[PDB]
Amino acid sequence: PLLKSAEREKEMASMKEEFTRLKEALEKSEARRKELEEKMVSLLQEKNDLQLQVQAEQDNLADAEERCDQLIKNKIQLEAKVKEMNERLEDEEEMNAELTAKKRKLEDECSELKRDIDDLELTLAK
């Protein structure tokens, strides 16, 4: 063009591209911002959902633990019963031994008595 029409058209073409560039810089920034807005929303929901699993698992451990408690009180009563039964067995066995001894010594005496009765009948008879 001629000097003046070229200079005028040049400034207009420059302002259009400068504008177009600012517009795109904004669009891009907005995109990054939007992607983050979405990520932050998703993470907060993820975090709060885990805070509930922690609670829930802690509760299951509480129920598991309480079950151990009952079992342990039960083991206590049972070990007490074993101790007690073993004591009685010893008493029984000991007594049994003692009775068997007395029954045998009585047996030796009936042997001897029947023998002495026979000796006196020998003395008497002849």
What is the residue whose two structure tokens read 């995109």?
31
x/- string (CB under 8 A) for a second copy, residues 52-81? -xx--xx-xx--xx-xx--xx-xx--xx-x
Per CB under 5 A, residues contacting Hg ion are 67-68, 109-110
User: Nearest-CA neighbor of 44 among 36, 32, 55, 33?
Assistant: 36
Q: How far is the CB of 93 from a second copy (least distance, A)?
A: 6
Contact status, residue 31 vs residue 23, Cβ threshold 8 Å: no
Q: Which of residues 2-41 bind a second copy (CB under 8 A)?
A: 15, 18-19, 22-23, 25-26, 29-30, 32-33, 36-37, 39-40
Contact status, residue 36 vs residue 44, Cβ threshold 8 Å: no
